[PDB]
Amino acid sequence: QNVPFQTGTTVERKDIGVSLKVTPHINDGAALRLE
Amino acid sequence: NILIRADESTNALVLLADPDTVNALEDIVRQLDVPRAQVLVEAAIVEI
């Protein structure tokens, strides 16, 4: 879901639920880096 | 003349140099590209 939350009433939208953010860095071969 | 420019797309490095300088910069690069090390940290807290 995506819910509101008060920052005062000056509410704001904000995401709730399973989430994943990957950033790789890939060598030509083994041993990848992940952020 | 000596020209080392970069590329952040494929993370590559373009060299333009005489072959002695090419071998010296290869000696720089082969000693600056290592797999780094990882730590597993287990902190523990006991309270009675």
| Burial tier of B17 (Cβ tally within 10 Å: 0-12, 13-18, 19+) | middle
Write down the residue that tokens 């720089």 correspond to: B28
CA atoms B20, B21, B24, B30: torsion sign: negative
Containing B28, the helix (H) or strand (E) segment is helix B19-29
Residue B25 in contact with residue B13, Cβ under 8 Å? no
Report how far residue A11's alpha carbon sits from residue B17's, in angstroms, rounded to the nearest whole number. Answer: 59
Resolution given for this structure, in angstroms: 3.6
- First and final C-alpha spacing in chain B: 70
List Cα–Cα distances, A18 to A1, A12, A13, B47, in angstroms.
10, 20, 16, 32
Residue type, A8: G
Residue type, A13: R
Report how far residue B48's alpha carbon sits from residue B18's, in angstroms, rounded to the nearest whole number. Answer: 70
Residue A26 CB neighbour total at 10 angstroms: 11
